[PDB]
């Protein structure tokens, strides 16, 4: 039998079949219920008029189990058309997910969906494996959460995992905010999806923020255009790099949190000195919010500045890192050894 691979993303579910090189189903992690049954994903956005919309896994931790079960039913029946009770399932979880949350997801899978066998994988560990490594630190920046996850010889080091206190959604919201300088008033949920696309299409990370502010003011070379759904054109200038700069300077968002460079550094420092060289030499980016042009070179400069000068800093930016969690799950669940890693329903039910 062929396993199903479900990456439970804070912003979008990625799902598909073991052995594929990418997820066949990607849809928003949203559940819509009548304002005065439930709709999931794109269907729920299309009906935002007549629905109240909710994110059940806003920051990578499931907070509404009824809605999460609707998302999983949508995954199996409307997206994959797969009987969950006839396939092994690999499910992903956030770094530092509480055991009680893992146990509740496991209960739902075994008792509501009757899945015959299941394995739960840490998202960042799967990304590391998808990069062809057993040791490294993964910087996974998604929609509602980011984490830095040191991994040694296959296993995350729980005492060193850090949360970076912003993610892609925060960046979309910040671009929405700073576009008010130019007179734009994007504010509705639907306009927010537009601004998300603007961010993905036009933004980039400056190698040196202060120098880019200086060079961008000296001409209009920075300005780039985008066609709105109504055919109007918007032009964006220094917002293109000021928006993702908040990953490095969360004070731009009014947060006291450390930026992703500082967080990665602190995360590595939690690991014993004898393994840090291998972490610094294997800093692996994953997730959609690591997709900005310029991120690897900027992160290399900044972590090199912070780290002892004897360390060799290597930031790895795989081209298909937006889906590397899901890909790592597809590989693991395809291995000839996967059948020895999972828990069966019979074992669970008799445990």
């Amino acid at each position: 039998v062929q396993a199903l691979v479900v990456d439970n993303g804070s912003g979008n579910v990625k799902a598909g079949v073991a052995g594929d090189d990418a997820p066949r189903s990607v849809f928003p992690s949203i559940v819509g219920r009548p304002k005065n049954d439930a709709y999931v994903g794109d269907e729920a956005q299309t009906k935002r008029g007549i629905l109240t919309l909710k994110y059940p896994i806003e920051h990578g931790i499931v907070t509404n189990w009824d809605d999460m079960e609707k998302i999983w039913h949508h995954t199996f029946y409307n997206e994959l058309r797969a009987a969950p009770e006839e396939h092994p399932v690999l499910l992903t979880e956030a770094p530092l997910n509480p055991k009680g949350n893992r146990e509740r997801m496991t209960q739902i899978m075994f008792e509501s969906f009757n899945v015959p066998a299941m394995y739960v994988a840490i998202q960042a560990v799967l990304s590391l494996y998808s990069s062809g490594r057993t040791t490294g630190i993964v910087l996974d920046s998604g929609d509602g959460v980011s984490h830095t996850v040191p991994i040694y010889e296959g296993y995350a080091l729980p005492h060193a995992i850090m949360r970076l206190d912003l993610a892609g959604r925060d960046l979309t919201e910040y671009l929405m905010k700073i576009l008010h300088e130019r007179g734009y008033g994007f504010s509705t949920s639907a306009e927010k999806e537009i601004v998300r696309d603007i961010k993905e299409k036009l933004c980039y990370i400056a190698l040196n923020f202060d120098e880019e502010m200086k060079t961008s003011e000296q001409s209009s070379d920075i300005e780039k255009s985008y066609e709105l759904p109504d055919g109007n054109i918007i032009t964006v200038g220094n917002e293109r790099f000021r928006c993702p700069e908040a990953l490095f300077q969360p004070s731009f968002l009014g947060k006291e949190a450390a930026g992703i460079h500082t967080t990665t550094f602190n995360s590595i420092k939690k690991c014993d000195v004898d393994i840090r060289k291998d972490l610094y030499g294997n800093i692996v980016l994953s997730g959609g919010t690591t997709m900005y042009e310029g991120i690897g070179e900027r992160l290399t400069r900044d972590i090199t500045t912070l780290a002892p000068s004897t360390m060799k800093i290597k930031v790895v930016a795989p081209p298909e890192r937006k889906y590397s969690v899901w890909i790592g799950g597809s590989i693991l669940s395809s291995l000839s050894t996967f059948q020895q890693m999972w828990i069966t329903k019979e074992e669970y039910d008799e445990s």
Binding site: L128, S131, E153, G154, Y155, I327, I331
Partner: protein, 117 residues
């Protein structure tokens, strides 16, 4: 229960497997030291017992192969009670220890087994 795990690390010597369609497949001993640039491999060196696991990544191997090599390395180490030291070996930048396992030195060949993806 995987048959090759059951054979791993029982005697001093050198064991080489190639990732082939999501499985670990012994390399014919007559090919030891020649590595297809299109493939990924797992190598266990046992010394009288000390264990060193190396996973070797060809410049043209596919993502399923390099990922499986990494994961099989972890699984073999666990099967050996965590006692193996793991080493990532990239074509053309291999450790002197890994190169030292092959009297004739390391060599590379074009091609490889097809991707499982």
């Amino acid at each position: 229960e995987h048959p090759e795990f059951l054979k791993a690390g029982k005697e001093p010597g050198l064991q080489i497997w190639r990732v082939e369609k999501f499985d670990l497949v012994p390399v014919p001993p007559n090919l030891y030291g020649d590595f297809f640039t299109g493939d990924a491999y797992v190598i266990l060196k046992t010394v009288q017992l000390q264990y060193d696991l190396h996973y070797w990544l060809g410049n043209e191997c596919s993502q399923d192969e390099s990922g499986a090599a990494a994961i099989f390395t972890v699984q073999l180490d666990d099967y050996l009670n965590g006692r193996a030291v793991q080493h990532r070996e990239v074509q053309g930048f291999e450790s002197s220890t890994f190169s030292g396992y092959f009297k004739s030195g390391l060599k590379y060949k074009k091609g490889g087994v097809a991707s499982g993806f």
